[PDB]
């Protein structure tokens, strides 16, 4: 039932490494990485391609590039003479060592991840994001420096967890640099609050933040940092009323607005009948009543074969006739 307890039971089956065990695996991984590079130089293949082929054999057939070419490339590696076959064995043992080194340090990420709960991600999500940092640390670790593994891996495990919080904890994503500004702004207001005995104003916050900050910038940053509210949140004690029941829809036109649009079109059509055949047709093209989009004076000219300036005077004349009829009927002013 409990996924957290199942994971803790599984990682407890891998015993912690000793100092001698830790050093040997790190040396094998470092030597294994070096042997793959030489093989690519000798064989003329892509180093990233060789590592995948070596990694696939170690992991076995239980993992879903097509396998038809994996086995063919493996024959190429094995067809080298003994002088070159040693690099293949060193590469194989290195990848096996890398798998063992990762699995033995799964308790380290758990102890770190427990200090980041309550910040928008679940405990199992923090653990899986910290496991990615542990994988990166194995790649970059150097055992010549005589430092222990947990000294270096702790930097990479914390970074992965912290970055994942800044990228997944908000419905409306906020960039990493802006997230850091919001966190710094909250620390400052907390310190001033315990010093002034009351909530600070935006002018005190801006002065403590430093140069480049005024009260207007403080208010805009606080407005950005607001999280949306759920449509399904209840109000009251009884559970039959929710936020979404009080929010009108303002995108679809109302029945009243749909009817006045059609009433206006019908009255506009009857006015245009008083015009001539071309005077009305030119007016509709220019205003965009037929296709929905207006057409240039030249575009109307090309439709009828006439010049640009001809359209301007005939289009203007039709307007004068419409204004003259309009003043004698007052059937069109209410729609305005």
């Amino acid at each position: 039932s409990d996924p957290v307890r199942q994971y803790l039971h599984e990682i407890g089956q891998v015993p912690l490494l000793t100092l001698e065990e830790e050093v040997e695996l790190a040396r094998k991984v470092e030597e294994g990485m070096e042997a793959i590079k030489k093989l690519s130089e000798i064989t003329g293949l892509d180093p990233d391609l060789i590592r995948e082929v070596v990694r696939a054999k170690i992991l076995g057939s239980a993992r879903v590039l097509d396998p038809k070419t994996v086995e063919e490339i493996d024959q190429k590696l094995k067809s080298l003479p003994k002088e070159h076959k040693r690099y293949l064995h060193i590469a194989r043992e290195g990848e096996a060592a890398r798998q063992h080194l990762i699995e033995a340090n799964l308790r380290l990420v758990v102890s770190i991840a427990k200090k980041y709960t309550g910040r928008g991600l679940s405990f199992l999500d923090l653990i899986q994001e910290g496991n990615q940092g542990l994988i990166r640390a194995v790649e970059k670790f150097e055992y010549k420096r005589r430092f222990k593994f947990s000294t270096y891996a702790t930097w990479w495990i914390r970074q992965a967890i912290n970055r994942a919080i800044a990228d997944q904890a908000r419905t409306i994503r906020i960039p990493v640099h802006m997230v850091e500004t919001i966190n710094k702004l909250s620390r400052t207001a907390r310190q001033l609050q315990q010093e002034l005995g009351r909530e600070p104003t935006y002018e005190e916050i801006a002065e403590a933040m430093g140069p480049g900050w005024d009260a207007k910038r403080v208010e805009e940053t606080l407005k950005i940092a607001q999280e949306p509210v759920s449509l399904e949140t209840p109000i009251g004690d009884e559970k039959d009323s929710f936020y979404g029941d009080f929010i009108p829809d303002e995108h679809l036109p109302s029945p009243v607005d749909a009817a006045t649009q059609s009433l206006l079109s019908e009255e506009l059509e009857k006015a245009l009948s008083k015009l001539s055949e071309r005077e009305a047709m030119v007016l509709k093209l220019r205003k965009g009543l037929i296709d929905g989009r207006e057409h240039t004076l030249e575009e109307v000219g090309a439709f009828f074969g006439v010049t640009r300036e001809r359209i301007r005077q005939i289009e203007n004349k039709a307007l004068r006739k419409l204004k003259y009829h309009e003043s004698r009927t007052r059937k069109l002013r209410d729609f305005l």
Binding site: E24, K57, L124, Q128, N131, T171
Partner: protein, 350 residues
């Protein structure tokens, strides 16, 4: 939904279905000639985590020696269950004994038992009982200032191992290049090295030791057992509904009332699938539909605040976990990390 439609078709209990779906037990899809506890393994058999590793990887255990004391067992000696390796601890299984980290190396020069102390940052490069010519490295080190080299020719002896590893395998000495590499799987009769001179006699995983220039085959099988909904989907695709219907009709003639009632309930689900034209494997999702955005809106209220529906947060969780699983698979992550991600993905869909 009781009773489960998947469980009825596959003849699986409710508790057995939960153990496979949520990554708690394996199910066998291809035994590959594996024997467990002297009993051959059959299909549709549920394996625990300990059982699966024993079949797939083999038996081995490491016994930590107390500091200072010396092992009574030579390196590469076959031992038996109950045989005491150290004066304080005993072996719990039979197999080959191996030295892990010899703290002191003793060389018998030819002219002379000199003793060298080995640090955790130093590794021995020569095997036990090796005739090492003058100038050849005996113990390697990070800094050549502390490195130990051979003053004269002699035989190297290893002493004071940190721990003893006992593994059930077969050891094949060789002289020329080997035909296999670490991580390969072999069957009896397969060539190992020396152009067919050395051949394996048992199934197992092969690892090649370059210091001891021997080949070890850890006794294990290439068994096909899987967990999760991907294993359940495999079983549902192989069902022959016509063949299952004829078997259930024969059980319908049993004298027992209980047998006839159980066969009727299984037949009702089978009949529904045959007549409708649906496929049983469509009950496992491969692509998840997404609701249109206007039915799960994100709207700005009159005051400037935003309002959103719960479905958006449930979709975001699934997408985040789906993307992380892809990156973990491309990085060659270990099976413990991968299994955790897959269990989280199933729960996100639920």
């Amino acid at each position: 939904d009781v009773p489960s439609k998947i469980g009825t078709l596959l003849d699986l209990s409710a508790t057995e279905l939960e153990q496979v779906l949520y990554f708690s037990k394996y199910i066998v899809l291809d035994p590959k000639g594996a024997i467990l506890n002297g009993v051959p393994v059959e299909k549709r058999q549920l394996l625990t985590d300990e059982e699966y590793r024993e079949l797939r990887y083999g038996k081995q255990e490491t016994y930590p020696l107390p500091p200072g004391v010396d092992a009574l067992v030579k390196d590469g000696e076959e031992v038996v269950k109950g045989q005491e390796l150290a004066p304080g601890v005993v072996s719990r299984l039979d197999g080959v004994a191996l030295y892990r980290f010899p703290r002191r190396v003793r060389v018998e020069y030819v002219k002379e038992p000199k003793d060298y102390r080995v640090q955790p940052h130093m590794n021995v490069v020569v095997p036990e009982g090796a005739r090492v010519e003058a100038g050849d490295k005996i113990v390697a080190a990070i800094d050549p200032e502390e490195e130990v080299i051979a003053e004269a020719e002699g035989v190297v002896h290893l002493h004071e191992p940190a721990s003893i590893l006992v593994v059930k395998a077969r050891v094949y000495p060789f002289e020329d290049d080997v035909e296999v590499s670490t991580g390969d799987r072999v069957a009896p009769g397969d060539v190992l090295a020396d152009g067919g001179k050395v051949k394996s006699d048992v199934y197992g995983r092969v690892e090649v030791d370059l210091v001891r220039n021997v080949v070890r085959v850890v006794e294990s099988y290439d068994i096909d057992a899987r967990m999760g909904a991907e294993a359940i989907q495999q079983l549902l695709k192989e069902l022959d509904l016509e063949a299952l219907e004829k078997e259930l009709l024969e059980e319908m003639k049993h004298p027992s009332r209980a047998r006839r009632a159980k066969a009727r309930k299984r037949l009702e689900v089978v009949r529904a699938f045959l007549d409708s034209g649906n496929r049983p494997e469509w009950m496992i999702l491969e692509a998840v539909p997404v609701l249109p955005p206007d039915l799960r809106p994100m709207v700005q209220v009159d005051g400037g605040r935003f309002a959103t529906s719960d479905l958006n947060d449930l979709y975001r969780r699934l997408i985040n976990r789906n993307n992380r699983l892809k990156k973990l698979l491309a990085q060659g992550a270990p099976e413990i990390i991968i299994r955790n991600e897959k269990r989280m993905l199933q729960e996100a869909v639920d």
